[PDB]
Amino acid sequence: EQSIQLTLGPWYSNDGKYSNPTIPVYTIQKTRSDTENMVVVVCGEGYTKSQQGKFINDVKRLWQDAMKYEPYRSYADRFNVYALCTASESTFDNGGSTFFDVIVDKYNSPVISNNLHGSQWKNHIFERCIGPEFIEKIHDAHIKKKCDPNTIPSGSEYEPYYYVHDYIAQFAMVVNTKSDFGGAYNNREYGFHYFISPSDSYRASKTFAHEFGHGLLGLGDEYSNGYLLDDKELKSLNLSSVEDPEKIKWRQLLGFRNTYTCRNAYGSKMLVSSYECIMRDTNYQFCEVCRLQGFKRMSQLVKDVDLYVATPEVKEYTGAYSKPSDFTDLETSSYYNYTYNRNDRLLSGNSKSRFNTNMNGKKIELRTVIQNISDKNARQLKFKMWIKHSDGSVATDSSGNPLQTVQTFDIPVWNDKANFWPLGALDHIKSDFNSGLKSCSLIYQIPSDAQLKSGDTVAFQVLDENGNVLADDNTETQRYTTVSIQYKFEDGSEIPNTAGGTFTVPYGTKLDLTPAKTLYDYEFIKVDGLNKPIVSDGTVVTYYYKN
Ligand SMILES: [Pr+3]
Ligand SMILES: [Zn+2]
Ligand SMILES: [Zn+2]
Numbered sequence: 001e002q003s004i005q006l007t008l009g010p011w012y013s014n015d016g017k018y019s020n021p022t023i024p025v026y027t028i029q030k031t032r033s034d035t036e037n038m039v040v041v042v043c044g045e046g047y048t049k050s051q052q053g054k055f056i057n058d059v060k061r062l063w064q065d066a067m068k069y070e071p072y073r074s075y076a077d078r079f080n081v082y083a084l085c086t087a088s089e090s091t092f093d094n095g096g097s098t099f100f101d102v103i104v105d106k107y108n109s110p111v112i113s114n115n116l117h118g119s120q121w122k123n124h125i126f127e128r129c130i131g132p133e134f135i136e137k138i139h140d141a142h143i144k145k146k147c148d149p150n151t152i153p154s155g156s157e158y159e160p161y162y163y164v165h166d167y168i169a170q171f172a173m174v175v176n177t178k179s180d181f182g183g184a185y186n187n188r189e190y191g192f193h194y195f196i197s198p199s200d201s202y203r204a205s206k207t208f209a210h211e212f213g214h215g216l217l218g219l220g221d222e223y224s225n226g227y228l229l230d231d232k233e234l235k236s237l238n239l240s241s242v243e244d245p246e247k248i249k250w251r252q253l254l255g256f257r258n259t260y261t262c263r264n265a266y267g268s269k270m271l272v273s274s275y276e277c278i279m280r281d282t283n284y285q286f287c288e289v290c291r292l293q294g295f296k297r298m299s300q301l302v303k304d305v306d307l308y309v310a311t312p313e314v315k316e317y318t319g320a321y322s323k324p325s326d327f328t329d330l331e332t333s334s335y336y337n338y339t340y341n342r343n344d345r346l347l348s349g350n351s352k353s354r355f356n357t358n359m360n361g362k363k364i365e366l367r368t369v370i371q372n373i374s375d376k377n378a379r380q381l382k383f384k385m386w387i388k389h390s391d392g393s394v395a396t397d398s399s400g401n402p403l404q405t406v407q408t409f410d411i412p413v414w415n416d417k418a419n420f421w422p423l424g425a426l427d428h429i430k431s432d433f434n435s436g437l438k439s440c441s442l443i444y445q446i447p448s449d450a451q452l453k454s455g456d457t458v459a460f461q462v463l464d465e466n467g468n469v470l471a472d473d474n475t476e477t478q479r480y481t482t483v484s485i486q487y488k489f490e491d492g493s494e495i496p497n498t499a500g501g502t503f504t505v506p507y508g509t510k511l512d513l514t515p516a517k518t519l520y521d522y523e524f525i526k527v528d529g530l531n532k533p534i535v536s537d538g539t540v541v542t543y544y545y546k547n
Contacts, residue, residue: 002496002497002520004084005020005023006133008020012129014117014119015097015118017097024084024497025082025134026084026498026499027080028498028499028501029077030080030081031077033516033517034140036302037078037079037080038075038216038301039079039080039168040170041084041126042082042084042173043084043171043172044083044099045099045102045176046093046175046176047092054199055083055174059174060501062205064501065208065209070286071290071294072209072294073503076503078302083499086100087099093176093177100112100122101116102173104181108181109183110181112196123185124191126191127192128191131161132145132149132164134168135167135168147160166424170193170216172194172195173194173197174197175198177199177201179198180202180207182207183211193215194215195211195214195215206278207282213278213290214279216297217237218237218293219237219238220279222264222272224264224270225268225270227270234429234430234431237289237293238272238279239271240272242271245325250433252369252433252439253288255322255327258274258276259287259288260327262275262334262335266332273287273290274289288369291310292310292371295371296371297420300422300423306372306373307373307411308371309470310370311471311475312471312475313349313367314365314366315348315367316345317365317443318363320341320345321338347364350477352458355387355457356454359446359450360447363443364446365444366440366444366460367442370438372436372437373417374413375413375415377413379465380465381411381464381465381470382407383440383461384460384463385405385459386403386405386460387403387404387457388457390456390457395450395452395453403446403447406442411436413436414435415436416432416435417436461473478507480504480507481505481534482502483502483503483540484502485500486500486540487545488543488545493547495519498519509533510532510534511541513530519543519545524543527542528542528544529542
């Protein structure tokens with residue numbers, strides 16, 4: 001079957017338990033060449049050889065649950081996901097020898113323990129052993145190994161393995177356990193880019209998405225502490241200590257959805273853009289700043305994503321939370337007072353029906369934020385907003401003029417792009433949060449003589465230069481559909497060492513990806529199910545490869 005073979009000398013397996021392991025490789029998802037997608041490699045800790053089927057199903061479960069969160073969900077079909085069936089002598093719960101020597105320290109942190117058996121480089125195993133074998137043999141780039149990982153290179157111990165984390169976007173280690181923990185190890189200068197999370201804890205999927213947010217998306221722990229120094233302020237994608245709303249990096253997002261800067265705990269000098277974010281508390285979704293920053297980060301790792309359009313909202317425009325001085329109080333009470341006010345004004349998503357015939361003479365606001373991913377093409381997006389009767393017709397005033405307004409917004413280029421986690425970067429140092437970023441507000445005065453009827457709602461569209469609808473008043477609550485991937489030989493047999501996963505897309509989506517020319521050594525033949533609206537759960541897209 002498909003596998004990689006490692007050579008682990010005493011620096012990686014000092015007790016000889018894994019001196020020459022054979023590691024079966026399973027493809028969970030490969031929708032395009034590895035050279036065009038983000039490659040995720042997932043290994044199991046504490047799974048015996050007879051438990052590798054549990055491991056594969058565990059990865060599929062955690063991965064599919066991660067793909068339900070924005071911003072990952074927008075990129076769901078642009079990941080290639082591989083499960084490496086690393087076999088431990090002992091299960092994790094039995095407490096004997098495991099592949100990765102993971103221990104849970106006194107702070108409940110899962111840690112690769114170099115000193116457990118004296119394997120002095122154990123926590124370098126991903127970039128020095130697993131990664132380079134994978135990239136030479138499985139990855140479509142087939143980059144030949146450059147250094148013997150069981151010898152000391154001339155010069156830097158680390159530089160020869162930097163290339164690993166450009167071909168493998170993320171290493172994840174799933175522990176076969178119910179224990180609730182999580183850890184992320186992000187220090188590319190010293191080779192570290194992996195996270196560790198449990199298979200069966202009560203919030204295992206939430207933890208996975210969270211540690212994935214640290215690792216791939218570059219997001220900071222919103223539960224952390226302290227006053228950020230100037231260099232750390234520039235460095236952080238989603239944390240701040242800047243109290244002045246006119247200077248805070250994410251000022252353009254203030255007042256959009258639940259973006260209202262606030263202290264992450266009473267008295268804290270550490271500020272978050274939203275109190276309700278998975279990066280502070282794993283029960284939440286990603287906040288709008290994390291969604292933006294993660295969407296930008298992933299755009300650096302693929303080639304064909306050029307625009308981010310946050311989901312627009314419509315709010316009664318009262319003047320509240322409309323200027324910087326409305327955001328100066330950073331207490332949690334101010335955050336929740338802001339979110340209550342938003343709910344009292346909301347006219348979109350699940351509050352569409354709050355529109356009523358008393359809205360004549362009132363102002364409404366269409367609000368979103370837009371990020372240009374291009375550093376070459378400025379963009380011009382047209383917003384349209386109108387009052388729609390329940391039968392779909394456009395409402396009018398008493399003179400017959402449609403209750404409709406339009407405004408075009410100019411989105412400047414992302415000239416700062418090369419400073420924001422580009423391919424090859426060892427870290428993020430400084431970026432201009434506002435480069436390529438435009439908060440867009442379209443305010444409409446509903447006429448006093450508006451001919452409103454019961455059941456009227458606000459409709460809207462964000463349009464590109466060709467009139468294509470990028471978002472509309474149905475986007476937020478639209479139905480998502482599950483699509484299943486299968487890999488088959490031309491005779492219909494399932495390809496061994498594949499375990500095709502599922503993800504979700506908006507109902508009606510036409511998938512349009514160029515399939516990879518090869519799967520392992522199998523040659524691509526044809527695909528069934530692409531370029532066709534996905535309109536049923538369990539829809540199967542079938543990739544056919546020559547045996
Ligand atoms: Pr052959
Ligand atoms: Zn955490
Ligand atoms: Zn966040």
